[PDB]
């Protein structure tokens, strides 16, 4: 039933905030927390993301966290800042100067106990907590380092609940910070062991979409985020509206994750303009519309979820989704039959008359980790910048472990890509 939301750090709280802005809209929830919608399908499964406070007020079951207060006052000052439960703001001061170690072990650990207090407040309330979804970046220090701390702290208290993450992979084309290839490989080392399902949001892809496809002369962060919110509303449509397929976090993980480690998804959205069903379908299976910087035709699809939103012909969606599997038959592994599923939601997303959201576990996602590991080993072969971490008491071995462990994951993707039937 209920999901508990956690956003953490600069990126985490930005994309987190926009996510709520957007679905609050879809469910007809205003910045004060009242309902002013037309359809009853809106409040059908509102409990998944909202609590019903006194005075029929809907309140995002969402916890905001940071080590600098900068980003969070921007949020409370934002369009929707008041909708949030003020108690669920939990920000430190000592900050983390984009040091993963400061979020994980040192600067983050004094605050970790106070975040967890707020989680328990929201979890004890749940009629039936299915699990948690997290928003954060893997380049920073708070969202990256303290987010991965938090997951581990929540898991050992809720080990049979589902752990879901929208993780933002760092690209040079968006942040000139030099230590990002370290932060990422360190948190990815945590993600493979401690999350059940992880949506890979790649900035190289978000920039390139904006510059190449959207012709944004200079793309802003809000420009990138407008894609992220479209995606997030897209991949959670089945969680939030009365539907059949993947209606809860567990049933999605069961359909999407054939092997516990390989749970890193390549989300897709169409139309990407920011319009026909055969067009939507082709687009959402096209490289350009991928929110991770990968050509899926450079690997094979283990599993795929497609969600078509808007008023359209379901026979047509059916015939088209069969079309693209037949024509692209080679790109779907033989040994998992019927690995592609299709949802259809009446309610179009705000603005569009119909969209298509794609979610794929492809071995082409190995392309994304390889890029991080080239950026990582290049800096680490020389032991560069390692004082910022060892300073915080860490160990150089814990980098190797994080290196070699991340290299195992890529093999595993290549293993199953190269597997056959009989």
């Amino acid at each position: 039933r209920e999901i508990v939301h956690i956003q953490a750090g600069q990126c985490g709280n930005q994309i987190g905030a926009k996510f709520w802005e957007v679905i609050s809209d879809e469910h007809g929830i205003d910045p004060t927390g009242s309902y002013h919608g037309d359809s009853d399908l809106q409040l059908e499964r509102i409990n998944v993301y909202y609590n019903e406070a006194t005075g029929n007020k809907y309140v995002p079951r969402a916890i905001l966290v940071d080590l600098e207060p900068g980003t969070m006052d921007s949020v409370r000052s934002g369009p929707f800042g008041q909708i949030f439960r003020p108690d669920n703001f939990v920000f430190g001061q000592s900050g983390a100067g984009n040091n993963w170690a400061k979020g994980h072990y040192t600067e983050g650990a004094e605050l970790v106990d106070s975040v967890l207090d707020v989680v328990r407040k929201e979890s004890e309330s749940c009629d039936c907590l299915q699990g948690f979804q997290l928003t954060h970046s893997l380049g920073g220090g708070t969202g990256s380092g303290m987010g991965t701390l938090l997951i581990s702290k929540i898991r050992e208290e809720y080990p049979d609940r589902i752990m879901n993450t929208f993780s933002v992979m760092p690209s040079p084309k968006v942040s000139d910070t030099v230590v990002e290839p370290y932060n990422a490989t360190l948190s990815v080392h945590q993600l493979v062991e401690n999350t059940d399902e992880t949506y890979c949001i790649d900035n190289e892809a978000l920039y390139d979409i904006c510059f190449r496809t959207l012709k944004l002369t200079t793309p802003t962060y809000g420009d990138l985020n407008h894609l992220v919110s479209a995606t997030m509303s897209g991949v959670t449509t089945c969680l939030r509206f009365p539907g059949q397929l993947n209606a809860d976090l567990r049933k999605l993980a069961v359909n999407m994750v054939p092997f516990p480690r390989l749970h890193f998804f390549m989300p897709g959205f169409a139309p990407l303009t920011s319009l026909t069903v055969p067009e939507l379908t082709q687009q959402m299976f096209d490289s350009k519309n991928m929110m991770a910087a990968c050509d899926p035709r450079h690997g094979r699809y283990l599993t795929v979820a497609a969600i078509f939103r808007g008023r359209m012909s379901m026979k047509e969606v059916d015939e088209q989704m069969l079309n693209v599997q037949n024509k692209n038959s080679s790109y779907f592994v033989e040994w998992i039959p019927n690995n592609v599923k299709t949802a259809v939601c009446d309610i179009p997303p705000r603005g569009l008359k119909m969209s298509a959201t794609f979610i794929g576990n492809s071995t082409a996602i190995q392309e994304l980790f390889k890029r991080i590991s080239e950026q990582f080993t290049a800096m680490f072969r020389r032991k560069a910048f390692l004082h910022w971490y060892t300073g915080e008491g860490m160990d150089e071995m814990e980098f190797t472990e994080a290196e070699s462990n991340m290299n195992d994951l890529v093999s595993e993707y290549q293993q199953y890509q190269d597997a056959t039937a009989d």
Partner: peptide, 5 residues
């Protein structure tokens, strides 16, 4: 690179 929400 110059990239503000």
């Amino acid at each position: 690179v110059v990239x503000x929400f």
